[PDB]
Amino acid sequence: TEAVVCVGTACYTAHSGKLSAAEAQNHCNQNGGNLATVKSKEEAQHVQRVLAQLLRREAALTARMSKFWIGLQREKGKCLDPSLPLKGFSWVGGGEDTPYSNWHKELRNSCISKRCVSLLLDLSQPLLPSRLPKWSEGPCGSPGSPGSNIEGFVCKFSFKGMCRPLALPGQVTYTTPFQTTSSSLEAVPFASAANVACSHYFLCKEKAPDVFDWGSSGPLC
Amino acid sequence: TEAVVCVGTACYTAHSGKLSAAEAQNHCNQNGGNLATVKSKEEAQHVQRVLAQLLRREAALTARMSKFWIGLQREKGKCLDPSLPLKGFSWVGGGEDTPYSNWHKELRNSCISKRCVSLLLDLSQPLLPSRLPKWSEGPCGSPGSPGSNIEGFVCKFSFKGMCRPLALPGQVTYTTPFQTTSSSLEAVPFASAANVACSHYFLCKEKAPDVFDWGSSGPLC
């Protein structure tokens, strides 16, 4: 994908794909991550931003109602819990009590099946910071039956260290460790090669403990 | 440019360029428009969005402090007016009373020179919906002395009619009348050619009075 945003300790990527929720999770995991969480309105905005990039980058995404997996699920055996915002669902990597939600409609009051969540974009309407993607809950899909209106997925990757973007007159292009490559990253994950051209190549490395930088005396160019 | 957003009746484009404010205005005007206004927080968000696209599209934009003209100026002879948000400045195409502003620092209390305004991005920080571009006021530049830290400009184009995006399985790519071409436009200006590929070509035309559509029976593909 070319759709990537990195801010602070987190990177997010949006992919097109007709994968089941398990398969999409396996795609993010192979890369060092997980299906994205949406634990706050601010996180929902990051995810909206990467999806918006995907739509600009992939002209083939034209399906009116388009859903993208995120990492929120309710296990078979657990009933809806309408005492909290997540309704009894929990995030990949643990958590059932974050304060934000954006549920599309009434949720199925079932205790008997696994429920997964996707972000619904109606590609007939503008994609604005004011109206964040709605959450749609449903069956989790299976190999070669991904689910109705599934068009893709959003991954999240977290790191303990990141480099600030490489300063310079000329052009720079970072290539992250989750095998995305791109330009204009707001934070660059540790172990990320950069590719400059005033073409110098550098890695993001830990110098002193918890100090991460490019190791380049003389802002180049 | 590839940086374009169209929403409702308005399109915005962001350009890189070391133009004076007069030259930048002449560039937008040649194309049917003007330097962009920022009349509301919602408009500031559209402009931030097109600038963010420019930064993703143009790897050469690396100057730490980067300013982009908008269409707000105070004429020689007119003093600062600190009784309103725009401080005595007025928009291209008229207006001195809009409610929004985001001034960077204290403005020069001068009555004797023309003052122009640009949006300041500090390309060392993340570009987030929470912290919109600051407004920086200064001299308006001249041919081959554009002004310090001027890196580009933002244009706005307004239309009385727009088409909703062309519905479909396959890919679509609109080309606007201000000679930008692109995909994923949220509104498409009247007289805009679209270029499809399931490669069918259509124009955005007025059918009944104030009715605008692509004129294509049978959602193609």
Textual characterization of the structure:
The structure is a homodimer. By secondary structure, chain A is mainly beta. Chain A folds into 2 domains: about 5-160, Mannose-Binding Protein A, Chain A (Roll), CATH 3.10.100.10; about 160-215, no CATH class. Chain A is built from 2 helices and 16 strands. Chain A has helices at about 20-30, 40-55, and strands spanning about 5, 10-15, 35, 65-75, 90, 115-120, 135-140, 150-160, 160-165, 170-175, 180, 190, 195, 200-205, 205, 210-215. In chain A, strands 1, 2, 3, 4, 5, 6, 7 and 8 form an 8-stranded mixed β-sheet that branches. In chain A, strands 11-10-13-14 form a 4-stranded antiparallel β-sheet, with no helix packed on it. In chain A, strand 13 and strand 14 form a beta hairpin. Chain A is elongated, with a radius of gyration of 19 Å. Chain A starts with a strand and ends in an 8-residue tail after the last strand. In chain A, about 40% of the residues are buried. Chains A and B meet through helix 2 and strand 10 of A and helix 2 and strand 10 of B.
Topology of helices and strands:
The structure is a homodimer of 221-residue chains.
Chain A: E1 4-7, E2 10-16, H1 21-30, E3 34-35, H2 41-57, E4 65-74, E5 90-91, E6 115-122, E7 134-138, E8 150-158, E9 162-163, E10 171-175, E11 181-182, E12 188-189, E13 193-197, E14 201-203, E15 205-206, E16 212-213
PDB class: cell adhesion
Keywords: C-type lectin-like domain, ctld, Sushi-like domain, dimerization, angiogenesis, CD93, cell adhesion
Assembly: dimeric
